[PDB]
Amino acid sequence: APLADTRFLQRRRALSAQLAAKRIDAMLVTHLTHIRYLSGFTGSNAALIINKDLSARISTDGRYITQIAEQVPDIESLMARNCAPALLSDINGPKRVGFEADYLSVSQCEELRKSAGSDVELIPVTGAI
Ligand SMILES: [Cl-]
């Protein structure tokens, strides 16, 4: 009988379950308090991708590599100055990727779109995840 799931694993699982209904394959979380709620990472720069199959990947800059391994030992990390574009550019299509349209700015979103692959579509999702 195993060690119980962390609350962060449980929150991710609940978001993963919300994805079918929002008609997306993955969610890109860029609002920091949302990333903290879903992962435990308390730093000031991150991006976080949660997939339908329950896997996840988290990104942060070089100042936080040690801390993210310590605070988030259950998600593989990617170092990047520009976190969200770097996670997105690593996705191989086809994939519908939701984003927090209530929180990303028009120009932050235009920057993301540049990094998306030829069959990765970004989908505006409203609400606090
Ligand atoms: Cl817990």
Side-chain angles (χ1 to χ4, degrees), residues 5-8:
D5 294 342
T6 61
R7 62 185 182 282
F8 303 102

Side-chain angles (χ1 to χ4, degrees), residues 41-51 53-90:
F41 175 64
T42 62
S44 56
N45 175 47
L48 173 61
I49 185 110
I50 303 310
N51 298 306
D53 73 355
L54 318 190
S55 70
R57 198 177 185 203
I58 194 168
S59 175
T60 192
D61 61 75
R63 134 198 73 147
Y64 287 128
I65 295 304
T66 295
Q67 174 179 143
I68 208 154
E70 152 164 37
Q71 292 186 315
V72 188
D74 53 348
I75 313 180
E76 173 189 70
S77 69
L78 169 64
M79 186 174 84
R81 278 160 206 196
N82 306 299
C83 287
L87 295 171
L88 190 57
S89 130
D90 271 7

